[PDB]
């Protein structure tokens, strides 16, 4: 979708709440920040 | 106009000066000094999101 | 995959292909000549004589 700055990519997988696009979608989780999976 | 000028490989016919595209916007131009044909492209963009 | 004699290989996913789509889905995905849907141009591909 585009370059996103400020979120760490995580190799886990969750049903998600903030859609970013093309499968990737961020959330707020733990020393607690924004992840992208 | 504003944008990035780059070396267009395409060849104009001698008598007409500059090209166009689908819209009536300049898409190429011939440099007055060295008679070089150039590309034209607006600088990159795209909306941001939070 | 012995479903009592019925043969579902045409609709069940095909693992051999890198896209795990059944042959019917591949056929009807190739037939539709869809456009570009959200590529990352990077602005470099955009400039040029394409
Ligand atoms: C089932 O269908 C596949 C694909 O057409 C075929 O290769 C295979 O021989 C068939 N087997 C049966 C159960 O007749």
Swiss-Prot record, chain B:
Origin: domain of life: Viruses
Name the record gives this protein: Spike protein S1
Binding partners and assembly: Binds to host ACE2. RBD also interacts with the N-linked glycan on 'Asn-90' of ACE2. Cleavage of S generates a polybasic C-terminal sequence on S1 that binds to host Neuropilin-1 (NRP1) and Neuropilin-2 (NRP2) receptors. Interacts with host integrin alpha-5/beta-1 (ITGA5:ITGB1) and with ACE2 in complex with integrin alpha-5/beta-1 (ITGA5:ITGB1). May interact via cytoplasmic c-terminus with M protein. May interact (via N-terminus) with host bilirubin and biliverdin, thereby preventing antibody binding to the SARS-CoV-2 spike NTD via an allosteric mechanism.
Described function: Attaches the virion to the cell membrane by interacting with host receptor, initiating the infection. The major receptor is host ACE2. When S2/S2' has been cleaved, binding to the receptor triggers direct fusion at the cell membrane. When S2/S2' has not been cleaved, binding to the receptor results in internalization of the virus by endocytosis using host TFRC and GRM2 and leading to fusion of the virion membrane with the host endosomal membrane. Alternatively, may use NRP1/NRP2 and integrin as entry receptors.
Gene behind the chain: S
Span within the parent record: 548 to 597 of 1273
Curated annotation (Swiss-Prot), chain C:
UniProt site positions, description: Cleavage: 21-22
Annotated glycan sites: 7
Region span, Disordered: 34-50
Domain of life, source organism: Viruses
UniProt region (Fusion peptide 1), positions on chain: 22-43
Job of this protein: Precursor of the fusion protein processed in the biosynthesis of the S protein and the formation of virus particle. Mediates fusion of the virion and cellular membranes by functioning as a class I viral fusion protein. Contains two viral fusion peptides that are unmasked after cleavage. The S2/S2' cleavage occurs during virus entry at the cell membrane by host TMPRSS2 or during endocytosis by host CSTL.
UniProt name for this protein: Spike protein S2
Organism for this UniProt entry: Severe acute respiratory syndrome coronavirus 2
Shown segment, full-protein numbering: 795 to 844 of 1273
């Amino acid at each position: 979708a585009g370059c996103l700055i400020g979120a760490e990519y995580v190799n886990n997988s969750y049903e998600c709440d903030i859609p970013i696009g093309a499968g990737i979608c961020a959330s707020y989780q733990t020393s607690q920040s924004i992840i992208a999976y | 106009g504003t944008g990035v000028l780059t070396e267009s490989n395409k060849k104009f016919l001698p008598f007409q000066q500059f090209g166009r595209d689908i819209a009536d916007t300049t898409d190429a131009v011939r440099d007055p000094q060295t008679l070089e044909i150039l590309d034209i492209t607006p600088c990159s963009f795209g909306g941001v999101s939070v | 995959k012995y479903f009592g004699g019925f043969n579902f290989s045409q609709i069940l996913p095909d693992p051999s292909k890198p896209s795990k789509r059944s042959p019917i889905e591949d056929l009807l995905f190739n037939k539709v000549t869809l456009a570009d849907a959200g590529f990352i141009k990077q602005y470099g591909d955009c400039l040029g004589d394409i």
